Amino acid sequence: DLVKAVGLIAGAGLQVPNGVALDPAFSFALSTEVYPKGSPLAGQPMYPAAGF
Amino acid sequence: PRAKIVGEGEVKPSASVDVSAFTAQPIKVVTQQRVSDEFMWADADYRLGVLQ
Amino acid sequence: PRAKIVGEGEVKPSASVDVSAFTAQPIKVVTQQRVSDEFMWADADYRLGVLQ
Amino acid sequence: DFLSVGKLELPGSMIGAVRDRAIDSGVLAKLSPEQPTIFGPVKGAVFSGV
């Protein structure tokens, strides 16, 4: 619901989104996932989320 | 603007500019609190920083 | 504004002054004139000083 | 009643001049390095096949 929201701004490849504001209740709904050991971005949060 | 291919002796044409504008009216926002002077005394007596 | 005589008890009233605002759009005035090259030469050759 | 700031029609301030989109200049200049020549036509020979 967030990635498809970004895909409306950069989908046409015109504007470039750089800021995002979340609701405290929504920021908890964002699944804490992070990247596995293999990927070059290991240890980094895959989503905004909460707790980080 | 869009360029135009011309030959030796051919007329060199012109284009245009599409300008625009946005406006914003200044808004005044306030907030007031009604605090009895009997309360401010207890605020400094029991030393509970309710107003500070 | 006109002040009013006030007794030691009567209410000191308020006068009414109306401030307005004008607006002037900039206008361009232009005066042109064409003289011949031969004339321009003649002014410089005979110390005439017509052009100045 | 009183002197408002409505009668006195205020001008304001200018934020500036912003361009809507980022400029999409070129791509041919990034893929194939420009090899400048003198004025006039250009021509090349191509030997194809074995």
mmCIF file of C-alpha atoms in Angstrom:
data_model
loop_
_atom_site.group_PDB
_atom_site.id
_atom_site.type_symbol
_atom_site.label_atom_id
_atom_site.label_comp_id
_atom_site.label_asym_id
_atom_site.label_seq_id
_atom_site.Cartn_x
_atom_site.Cartn_y
_atom_site.Cartn_z
ATOM 1 C CA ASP A 1 0.000 0.000 0.000
ATOM 2 C CA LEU A 2 3.099 2.199 0.246
ATOM 3 C CA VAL A 3 5.162 0.940 -2.693
ATOM 4 C CA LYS A 4 2.156 1.247 -4.999
ATOM 5 C CA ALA A 5 1.750 4.780 -3.644
ATOM 6 C CA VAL A 6 5.324 5.640 -4.598
ATOM 7 C CA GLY A 7 4.644 3.978 -7.952
ATOM 8 C CA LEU A 8 2.143 6.738 -8.711
ATOM 9 C CA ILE A 9 4.717 9.517 -8.397
ATOM 10 C CA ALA A 10 7.697 7.866 -10.085
ATOM 11 C CA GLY A 11 5.589 5.553 -12.237
ATOM 12 C CA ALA A 12 5.466 8.062 -15.079
ATOM 13 C CA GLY A 13 9.093 8.912 -14.346
ATOM 14 C CA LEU A 14 8.398 12.630 -14.035
ATOM 15 C CA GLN A 15 8.476 13.674 -10.379
ATOM 16 C CA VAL A 16 10.914 12.286 -7.807
ATOM 17 C CA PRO A 17 9.498 11.523 -4.328
ATOM 18 C CA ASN A 18 11.889 12.149 -1.435
ATOM 19 C CA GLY A 19 9.651 12.604 1.618
ATOM 20 C CA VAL A 20 7.161 10.350 3.393
ATOM 21 C CA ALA A 21 4.901 10.952 6.403
ATOM 22 C CA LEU A 22 3.241 8.081 8.273
ATOM 23 C CA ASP A 23 0.512 7.747 10.889
ATOM 24 C CA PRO A 24 1.647 6.261 14.251
ATOM 25 C CA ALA A 25 -0.883 3.428 13.878
ATOM 26 C CA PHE A 26 0.160 2.756 10.280
ATOM 27 C CA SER A 27 3.873 2.759 11.110
ATOM 28 C CA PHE A 28 3.262 -0.276 13.321
ATOM 29 C CA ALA A 29 1.334 -2.104 10.601
ATOM 30 C CA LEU A 30 4.432 -1.939 8.398
ATOM 31 C CA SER A 31 5.897 -5.437 8.680
ATOM 32 C CA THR A 32 9.373 -5.580 10.216
ATOM 33 C CA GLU A 33 11.272 -7.705 7.701
ATOM 34 C CA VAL A 34 14.849 -6.557 6.907
ATOM 35 C CA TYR A 35 17.118 -8.215 4.331
ATOM 36 C CA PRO A 36 18.609 -11.717 4.809
ATOM 37 C CA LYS A 37 22.322 -12.527 5.153
ATOM 38 C CA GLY A 38 22.890 -12.962 1.419
ATOM 39 C CA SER A 39 21.754 -9.583 0.085
ATOM 40 C CA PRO A 40 24.281 -6.692 0.047
ATOM 41 C CA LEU A 41 21.879 -4.674 2.217
ATOM 42 C CA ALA A 42 21.935 -7.176 5.084
ATOM 43 C CA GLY A 43 20.950 -5.745 8.458
ATOM 44 C CA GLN A 44 19.009 -2.782 7.087
ATOM 45 C CA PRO A 45 15.241 -2.345 7.605
ATOM 46 C CA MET A 46 13.276 -3.154 4.439
ATOM 47 C CA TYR A 47 10.485 -0.806 5.523
ATOM 48 C CA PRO A 48 10.050 2.341 7.674
ATOM 49 C CA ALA A 49 8.188 0.481 10.453
ATOM 50 C CA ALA A 50 8.598 1.173 14.174
ATOM 51 C CA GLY A 51 11.192 0.244 16.786
ATOM 52 C CA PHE A 52 14.166 0.951 14.543
ATOM 53 C CA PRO B 1 11.587 24.038 -26.008
ATOM 54 C CA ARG B 2 11.823 22.122 -29.289
ATOM 55 C CA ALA B 3 14.670 22.590 -31.767
ATOM 56 C CA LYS B 4 14.106 22.792 -35.521
ATOM 57 C CA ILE B 5 16.127 21.512 -38.475
ATOM 58 C CA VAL B 6 16.824 24.225 -41.043
ATOM 59 C CA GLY B 7 18.805 24.406 -44.276
ATOM 60 C CA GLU B 8 20.912 27.111 -45.912
ATOM 61 C CA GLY B 9 18.433 29.906 -46.572
ATOM 62 C CA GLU B 10 15.495 28.327 -44.754
ATOM 63 C CA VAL B 11 13.550 30.323 -42.148
ATOM 64 C CA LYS B 12 14.623 29.850 -38.526
ATOM 65 C CA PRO B 13 11.374 29.698 -36.485
ATOM 66 C CA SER B 14 10.651 30.191 -32.777
ATOM 67 C CA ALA B 15 8.884 28.484 -29.872
ATOM 68 C CA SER B 16 7.256 29.620 -26.625
ATOM 69 C CA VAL B 17 7.290 29.294 -22.836
ATOM 70 C CA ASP B 18 4.562 27.834 -20.618
ATOM 71 C CA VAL B 19 4.687 29.691 -17.299
ATOM 72 C CA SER B 20 2.432 29.405 -14.246
ATOM 73 C CA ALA B 21 1.970 30.608 -10.665
ATOM 74 C CA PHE B 22 0.587 29.759 -7.226
ATOM 75 C CA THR B 23 -0.694 31.918 -4.369
ATOM 76 C CA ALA B 24 -0.945 31.543 -0.594
ATOM 77 C CA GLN B 25 -2.864 33.641 1.928
ATOM 78 C CA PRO B 26 -1.262 34.222 5.357
ATOM 79 C CA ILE B 27 -3.352 32.731 8.173
ATOM 80 C CA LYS B 28 -3.379 33.797 11.822
ATOM 81 C CA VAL B 29 -3.552 31.050 14.448
ATOM 82 C CA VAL B 30 -3.770 31.461 18.229
ATOM 83 C CA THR B 31 -4.466 29.513 21.416
ATOM 84 C CA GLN B 32 -5.341 30.753 24.903
ATOM 85 C CA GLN B 33 -5.425 29.276 28.405
ATOM 86 C CA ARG B 34 -7.402 30.559 31.394
ATOM 87 C CA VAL B 35 -5.415 30.072 34.607
ATOM 88 C CA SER B 36 -6.612 31.346 37.993
ATOM 89 C CA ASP B 37 -4.047 33.263 40.056
ATOM 90 C CA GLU B 38 -4.888 30.931 42.942
ATOM 91 C CA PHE B 39 -3.503 28.096 40.814
ATOM 92 C CA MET B 40 -0.214 29.806 39.961
ATOM 93 C CA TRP B 41 0.472 30.177 43.684
ATOM 94 C CA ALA B 42 0.073 26.447 44.281
ATOM 95 C CA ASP B 43 2.204 26.019 41.163
ATOM 96 C CA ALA B 44 5.120 27.577 43.047
ATOM 97 C CA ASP B 45 4.207 26.342 46.531
ATOM 98 C CA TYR B 46 4.211 22.567 46.012
ATOM 99 C CA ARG B 47 6.866 23.112 43.332
ATOM 100 C CA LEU B 48 5.039 21.137 40.643
ATOM 101 C CA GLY B 49 5.964 22.640 37.281
ATOM 102 C CA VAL B 50 2.505 22.563 35.726
ATOM 103 C CA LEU B 51 2.838 26.024 34.189
ATOM 104 C CA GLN B 52 6.600 25.943 33.623
ATOM 105 C CA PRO C 1 -9.556 63.281 13.458
ATOM 106 C CA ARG C 2 -11.173 65.595 16.015
ATOM 107 C CA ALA C 3 -10.619 65.292 19.765
ATOM 108 C CA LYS C 4 -13.435 65.648 22.292
ATOM 109 C CA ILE C 5 -13.622 67.452 25.637
ATOM 110 C CA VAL C 6 -13.650 64.877 28.430
ATOM 111 C CA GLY C 7 -14.922 65.353 31.972
ATOM 112 C CA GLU C 8 -13.386 63.549 34.941
ATOM 113 C CA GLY C 9 -16.009 60.821 34.564
ATOM 114 C CA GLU C 10 -17.305 60.733 30.987
ATOM 115 C CA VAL C 11 -16.154 58.081 28.509
ATOM 116 C CA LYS C 12 -13.248 59.009 26.236
ATOM 117 C CA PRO C 13 -14.613 58.288 22.726
ATOM 118 C CA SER C 14 -12.872 57.158 19.534
ATOM 119 C CA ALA C 15 -12.657 58.959 16.193
ATOM 120 C CA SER C 16 -12.946 57.333 12.770
ATOM 121 C CA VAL C 17 -10.213 57.714 10.154
ATOM 122 C CA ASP C 18 -10.475 55.837 6.860
ATOM 123 C CA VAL C 19 -7.226 54.722 5.233
ATOM 124 C CA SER C 20 -7.399 53.838 1.541
ATOM 125 C CA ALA C 21 -4.879 52.514 -0.985
ATOM 126 C CA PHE C 22 -4.095 53.466 -4.581
ATOM 127 C CA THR C 23 -2.399 51.530 -7.364
ATOM 128 C CA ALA C 24 -0.421 52.698 -10.386
ATOM 129 C CA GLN C 25 0.524 50.456 -13.301
ATOM 130 C CA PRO C 26 3.848 51.273 -15.005
ATOM 131 C CA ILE C 27 3.518 52.752 -18.496
ATOM 132 C CA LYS C 28 6.226 52.981 -21.145
ATOM 133 C CA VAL C 29 6.561 56.137 -23.249
ATOM 134 C CA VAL C 30 8.795 56.125 -26.324
ATOM 135 C CA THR C 31 9.833 58.798 -28.825
ATOM 136 C CA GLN C 32 11.572 57.707 -32.019
ATOM 137 C CA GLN C 33 13.050 59.549 -34.999
ATOM 138 C CA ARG C 34 15.063 58.647 -38.099
ATOM 139 C CA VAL C 35 17.747 60.774 -39.745
ATOM 140 C CA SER C 36 19.764 60.091 -42.895
ATOM 141 C CA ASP C 37 23.396 58.963 -42.800
ATOM 142 C CA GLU C 38 24.355 61.942 -44.971
ATOM 143 C CA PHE C 39 22.717 64.266 -42.448
ATOM 144 C CA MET C 40 24.523 62.615 -39.523
ATOM 145 C CA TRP C 41 27.745 63.198 -41.448
ATOM 146 C CA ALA C 42 26.826 66.815 -42.192
ATOM 147 C CA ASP C 43 26.389 67.538 -38.485
ATOM 148 C CA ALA C 44 29.900 66.246 -37.748
ATOM 149 C CA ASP C 45 31.622 67.888 -40.720
ATOM 150 C CA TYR C 46 30.325 71.451 -40.336
ATOM 151 C CA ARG C 47 30.465 71.599 -36.523
ATOM 152 C CA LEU C 48 26.701 72.130 -36.641
ATOM 153 C CA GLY C 49 25.750 70.389 -33.400
ATOM 154 C CA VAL C 50 22.156 69.708 -34.453
ATOM 155 C CA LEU C 51 22.144 66.114 -33.187
ATOM 156 C CA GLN C 52 23.244 67.257 -29.721
ATOM 157 C CA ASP D 1 -14.845 50.691 13.333
ATOM 158 C CA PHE D 2 -11.083 50.328 12.875
ATOM 159 C CA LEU D 3 -8.231 50.352 10.354
ATOM 160 C CA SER D 4 -8.081 46.965 8.637
ATOM 161 C CA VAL D 5 -5.373 45.517 6.400
ATOM 162 C CA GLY D 6 -8.006 44.751 3.775
ATOM 163 C CA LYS D 7 -8.487 48.289 2.494
ATOM 164 C CA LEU D 8 -4.713 48.517 2.192
ATOM 165 C CA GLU D 9 -4.310 45.867 -0.511
ATOM 166 C CA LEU D 10 -0.895 44.374 0.246
ATOM 167 C CA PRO D 11 1.526 43.301 -2.516
ATOM 168 C CA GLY D 12 3.427 40.394 -0.961
ATOM 169 C CA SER D 13 6.649 38.447 -1.431
ATOM 170 C CA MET D 14 8.239 36.292 -4.133
ATOM 171 C CA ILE D 15 9.215 32.699 -3.346
ATOM 172 C CA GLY D 16 11.306 32.586 -6.507
ATOM 173 C CA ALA D 17 11.358 30.741 -9.820
ATOM 174 C CA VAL D 18 11.146 26.948 -9.701
ATOM 175 C CA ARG D 19 11.288 24.546 -12.642
ATOM 176 C CA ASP D 20 8.624 21.815 -12.566
ATOM 177 C CA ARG D 21 10.592 18.828 -13.860
ATOM 178 C CA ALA D 22 14.248 17.862 -13.757
ATOM 179 C CA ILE D 23 15.877 18.493 -17.128
ATOM 180 C CA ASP D 24 15.991 15.538 -19.529
ATOM 181 C CA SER D 25 18.899 16.848 -21.607
ATOM 182 C CA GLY D 26 20.402 13.867 -23.419
ATOM 183 C CA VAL D 27 21.417 10.213 -23.584
ATOM 184 C CA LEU D 28 23.415 9.974 -26.815
ATOM 185 C CA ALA D 29 26.129 12.061 -25.152
ATOM 186 C CA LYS D 30 26.521 9.487 -22.372
ATOM 187 C CA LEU D 31 26.537 6.282 -24.425
ATOM 188 C CA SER D 32 28.658 7.302 -27.413
ATOM 189 C CA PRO D 33 31.481 9.826 -26.791
ATOM 190 C CA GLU D 34 31.220 12.836 -29.111
ATOM 191 C CA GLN D 35 33.850 12.735 -31.852
ATOM 192 C CA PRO D 36 33.902 16.265 -33.341
ATOM 193 C CA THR D 37 34.936 16.933 -36.941
ATOM 194 C CA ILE D 38 35.239 19.865 -39.340
ATOM 195 C CA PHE D 39 32.230 21.184 -41.249
ATOM 196 C CA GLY D 40 30.912 19.129 -44.150
ATOM 197 C CA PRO D 41 29.507 15.628 -44.731
ATOM 198 C CA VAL D 42 30.951 12.465 -43.215
ATOM 199 C CA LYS D 43 31.361 9.087 -44.895
ATOM 200 C CA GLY D 44 32.672 5.650 -43.988
ATOM 201 C CA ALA D 45 33.303 2.304 -45.664
ATOM 202 C CA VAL D 46 31.988 -0.972 -44.248
ATOM 203 C CA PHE D 47 33.453 -4.334 -45.265
ATOM 204 C CA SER D 48 30.928 -7.050 -44.430
ATOM 205 C CA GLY D 49 30.913 -10.821 -44.864
ATOM 206 C CA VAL D 50 33.547 -13.536 -45.152
#
